[PDB]
Amino acid sequence: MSYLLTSALLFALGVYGVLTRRTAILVFLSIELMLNAANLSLVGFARAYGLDGQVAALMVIAVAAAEVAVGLGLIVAIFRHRESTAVDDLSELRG
């Protein structure tokens, strides 16, 4: 229980990260922290409901990895020759 609240606080912290971070990689990082908050909550509740939540959290980790591969791949691809990685440098597409 004491942990669950820390999980929520962490997720919030990650949200703050995403909203605050100026560069792509670091926004992505803040997202990773959020994911981890979720994982911790999954562990606590697994400890309440019996272990399926651990397998869950592990699958979650795997998934996270996959999207890290693709996401960093994208970040590198788009910004390789291009200059500074600040994500607001791409504002061409306007509503």
Binding site: L58, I61, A62, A65, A69, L72, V76, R80
Partner: protein, 92 residues
Amino acid sequence: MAPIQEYVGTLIYVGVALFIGVAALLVGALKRFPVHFYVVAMLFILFDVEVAFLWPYAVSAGGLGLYGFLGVLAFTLLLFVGFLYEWWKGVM
């Protein structure tokens, strides 16, 4: 399985090791750039995952029988289709 004491012991061990590290330090007081090194880093972060799944099988394996083995086989073959791809694609 293991008594919880030995994780604490692990941590203590870490403490000693770190302190000694600090000690030795104080005796010190006495284009294409990403591609390769990215691809072969990403594949690390994938094989770590693979193995992270293979370990739970390797322990409870004979208990899981031919269907368990079949599962681990399928899994392995999928991921190796991936690796075989980025191998046949080439990495340099």
